[PDB]
């Protein structure tokens, strides 16, 4: 995340997926070296929403890191679309518009998968 | 600030005559505003300070 307090910048929004992941990584590389009550109020809720989104990366085992892969069967009811179909014919905002009727259910399912994964290695 | 190539007409509702039409130029029109008159400033004590 690229801000004075740290939060991601829109690196190359109009770029289609296959280049935009590369620019997400180069976003990271340049971003961390680039790093009256209105200002205080705004950056306190910036802290609050930041710690919120890092707790979403916290409770999926992702520990506050990008490109964090977890083990969920991505249902064809959420999207029947093929990989290269969306990953070379689309950008990211219209795909978030596509699946904004599922995001609470996706956070639901990744949380059962993370607690299931840690409870199973808690067994093993 | 100047628009560069066009001059720009802006409104909320051009059919509505009540809404103010902004007109934005493209060249900085000059104006010089002066009061060409000596008028000195002196003070009265009305209160403490």
């Amino acid at each position: 995340g690229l801000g004075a307090m740290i939060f991601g910048f829109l690196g190359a929004a109009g770029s289609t997926m296959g280049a935009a992941s590369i620019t997400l990584t180069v976003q990271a590389r340049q971003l961390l070296s680039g790093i009256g009550i209105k200002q205080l109020q705004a950056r306190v809720l910036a802290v609050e929403r930041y710690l919120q989104d890092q707790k979403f990366l916290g409770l999926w085992g992702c520990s506050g890191k990008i490109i964090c892969c977890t083990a969920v069967p991505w249902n064809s009811s959420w999207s029947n679309k093929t990989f290269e179909e969306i990953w070379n014919n689309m950008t990211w905002i219209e795909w978030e518009r596509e699946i904004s009727n599922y995001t609470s259910q996706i956070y639901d399912i990744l949380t059962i998968s993370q607690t299931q994964q840690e409870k199973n290695e808690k067994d093993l | 600030s100047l628009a560069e190539e066009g001059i720009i007409i802006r409104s909320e509702n051009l059919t509505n005559n009540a809404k103010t039409i902004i007109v934005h130029f493209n060249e900085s029109v000059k104006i010089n505003c002066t009061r060409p008159s000596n008028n000195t400033r002196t003070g009265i004590h009305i209160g403490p300070g």
Epitope: I93, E94, R97, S100 | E12, N13
Partner: nanobody, 130 residues
Framework: QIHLVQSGTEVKKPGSSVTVSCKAY?????????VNWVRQAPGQSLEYIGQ??????????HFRGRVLISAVDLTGSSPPISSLEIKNLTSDDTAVYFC??????????????????????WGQGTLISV
């Protein structure tokens, strides 16, 4: 609020050309709003024809190269008005026509999707007989 009207009911000759207006009393522009031209055969269900959407005129492959749509937005005396024009009205073109504006500003509302869109506020439908 938004309201739509258009031209009246016009009956013409086979092999004529027709134009149908679209006066949008409430559209702040047709830059951000988009309008849609939809036919309806007598009794038969409604069929899409064309649209204007950020000044890209389009019609269907069932209407490419024969039917033409225009739009001029908000001027002084005129509200934003589109217009559907058809040359060579066959007996198939005997239909009720429709103009409808959609709000395309807040991109995550879901009334629209990348050119195609759900049609917010309709007009009155115009009979055209051949």
């Amino acid at each position: 609020q938004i309201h739509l009207v258009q031209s009246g009911t016009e009956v013409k000759k086979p092999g004529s050309s027709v134009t149908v207006s679209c006066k949008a009393y409430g559209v702040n522009t047709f830059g951000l709003y988009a309008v849609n031209w939809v036919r309806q055969a007598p009794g038969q269900s409604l069929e899409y024809i064309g649209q204007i959407w950020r000044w890209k005129s389009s019609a269907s492959h069932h209407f490419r190269g024969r039917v033409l749509i225009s739009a001029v937005d908000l001027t002084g005396s005129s509200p934003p008005i589109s217009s559907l024009e058809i040359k060579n009205l066959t007996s198939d073109d005997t239909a009720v026509y429709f103009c409808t504006t959609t709000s395309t500003y807040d991109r995550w509302s879901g009334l629209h999707h990348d050119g195609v869109m759900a049609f917010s506020s309709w007009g009155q439908g115009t009979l055209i007989s051949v």
